[PDB]
Design a protein around this ligand. Structure first.
Ligand SMILES: Nc1ncnc2c1ncn2[C@@H]1O[C@H](CSCC[C@H](N)C(=O)O)[C@@H](O)[C@H]1O
Ligand SMILES: Nc1ncnc2c1ncn2[C@@H]1O[C@H](CSCC[C@H](N)C(=O)O)[C@@H](O)[C@H]1O
Lengths: 225, 231
């Protein structure tokens, strides 16, 4: 609903940046996600990354809660790449997709921290409906360490007035899922974690102390039984 | 989010730095005039979420009797270093209404200063916190509450885009890493008004960094505040 707003304002604005620059986890995906299966990009947004995943996967469906995102994404449609609206909370939509495309792998980039922790049960049921017993999910999320990285950065290049560092902290509300809490979310719902590492994305922009801001991510790959 | 962990790390260093080290008054508590004008002058002051005790040392040089309280034992262990006659530091969880009542019986009816405390806790604990506030203030007492605006996330986003840009592809991913504050000026007003508070004084304050970004721009920490009385 607020994500519908965000994609209307972003789309007021083929070729590909570099290699594994877009998807540095790609080798992990090909290693753990059967390529013979179709791939759903849950929370595909404007389809940029979905397009780049398609270079490697022959049957790809991006889906997203926002109709703006899908409409913009739909621009990139081709044979073997397709886009559709789907709320990860709407298990009956997930069922309808599963029965269309078949058992499928599912890649999420940023989706769990994109929604209320109360919608996670439904989202994970959706993932389970899409995967059946042959499909696997690749899920990557920005860690609570991101807020620690913004706190540090405000700390030295935009310090709050004196004695106001902890009030600044109060406004820096972290994400819920680190490495262990991502693994607990999948395991407590009946998933087998096949793989699970961390991953950092540096900024090409040089901060005054010759440091580079680091965006901290964490991913796992999971399957049912 | 984990306030004992924060304060043990910050308190791991420091001999507490008197307030005159960091500023010459005005900059620590720009809002003090709004407090002198609308709070009752005779009542003791509670600093809810007092932390290491810096701002409460400052306030206790304008207010005869002041008690700073915080969830975090570490925070209070450090704050107690600043202790002197008329300046007092205790462990109080704003949730724990029983503890809030025990203070009210000891201290008497009080004014309460809150900095950041409502966004420092879970919206689920807000009804309990407002009850703690009603218990300390009684009839005569009032609250000054100041909170970092929801548009802080927007300021951080602007900063990051300009000097710490995300990897190409990661812009939307990084917007989700921004868990937004929920009390803007209209929302902080409602929370107090829908729980039987009268709002005497409500405005917005912008507290600026002295550090100059490479842009030439200065970082603007967006605040909002109000003074509330039990109706
Ligand atoms: N319940 C839900 N179901 C599906 N998508 C959702 C959702 N809640 C949020 N989203 C989507 O999740 C995305 C989060 S950020 C965009 C992620 C995208 N794969 C990328 O890296 O570019 C947004 O597109 C948002 O619209
Ligand atoms: N439930 C709760 N009850 C009491 N204090 C709390 C609390 N949750 C958070 N706090 C405290 O509220 C503060 C929020 S930020 C710190 C503001 C403080 N006046 C200062 O300038 O340092 C922290 O000190 C934190 O320890």
């Amino acid at each position: 609903v607020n994500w519908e707003r965000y994609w209307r304002d972003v789309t007021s604005d083929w070729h590909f940046g570099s290699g594994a620059e877009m998807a540095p986890y790609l080798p992990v995906m090909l290693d753990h996600l059967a390529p013979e299966l179709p791939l759903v990009d849950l929370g595909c947004g404007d389809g940029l990354l979905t397009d780049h995943l398609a270079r490697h996967y022959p049957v790809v469906v991006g889906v997203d809660v926002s109709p703006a995102a899908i409409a913009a994404a739909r621009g990139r449609a081709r044979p073997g790449l397709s886009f559709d609206v789907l709320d990860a909370t709407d298990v009956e939509a997930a069922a309808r997709l599963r029965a269309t495309v078949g058992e499928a792998n599912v890649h999420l980039r940023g989706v769990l921290h994109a929604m209320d922790p109360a919608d996670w049960p439904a989202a994970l049921t959706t993932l389970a409906t899409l995967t059946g017993r042959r499909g696997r999910v690749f899920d990557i999320e920005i860690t609570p360490a991101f807020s620690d990285a913004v706190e540090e950065m405000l700390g030295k290049f935009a310090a709050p007035p004196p004695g106001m560092a902890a009030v600044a902290r109060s406004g820096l509300r972290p994400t819920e899922l680190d490495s262990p809490s991502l693994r607990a979310l999948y395991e407590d719902t009946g998933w087998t974690v096949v793989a699970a590492e961390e991953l950092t994305g540096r900024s090409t922009m040089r901060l005054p102390d010759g440091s580079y801001f680091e965006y901290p991510f964490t991913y796992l790959v999971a399957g049912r039984r």
